[PDB]
Design a protein around this ligand. Structure first.
Ligand SMILES: NS(=O)(=O)c1ccccc1F
Length: 126
């Protein structure tokens, strides 16, 4: 069901949370080789999550589930904010700009924490 597809998407999201926190520890410790690998892993995870969320939204649309569509439109918009900040973080790593990297890292945490009440709302709506 669309609900079980959302649970699969939620787990992929939690995997990115786990890798992100590991990455943050590596950055603080100066282990740039580790950071590079974690950023690659995160890119692949976010790409997967993005695709799953799109399939969930498209299915809710085909089902006529208006409330779930509303919530998923809001959630996918916030996802794109996180993606843009993530991409900027990757660029800051490439460029050696640790000040920008720290900034983007905190921003991405706050955007992610904010979007969590909506994430739980969607589960209940599908
Ligand atoms: N989980 S999020 O903040 O919407 C997000 C989406 C895509 C990339 C990085 C991110 F942080």
């Amino acid at each position: 069901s669309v609900k079980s597809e959302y649970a699969e998407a939620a787990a992929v999201g939690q995997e990115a949370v786990a890798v992100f926190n590991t990455m943050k520890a590596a950055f603080q410790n100066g282990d740039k080789e580790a950071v590079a690998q974690y950023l690659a892993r995160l890119a692949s995870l976010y790409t997967r999550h993005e695709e799953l969320l799109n399939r969930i939204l498209e299915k809710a649309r085909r089902e006529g589930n208006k409330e779930a569509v509303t919530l998923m439109n809001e959630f996918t918009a916030t996802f794109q904010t996180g993606k843009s900040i993530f991409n900027a973080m990757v660029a800051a790593f490439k460029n050696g700009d640790d000040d920008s990297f720290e900034s983007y890292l905190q921003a991405l945490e706050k955007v992610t924490a904010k979007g969590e009440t909506l994430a739980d709302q969607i589960a209940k709506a599908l």
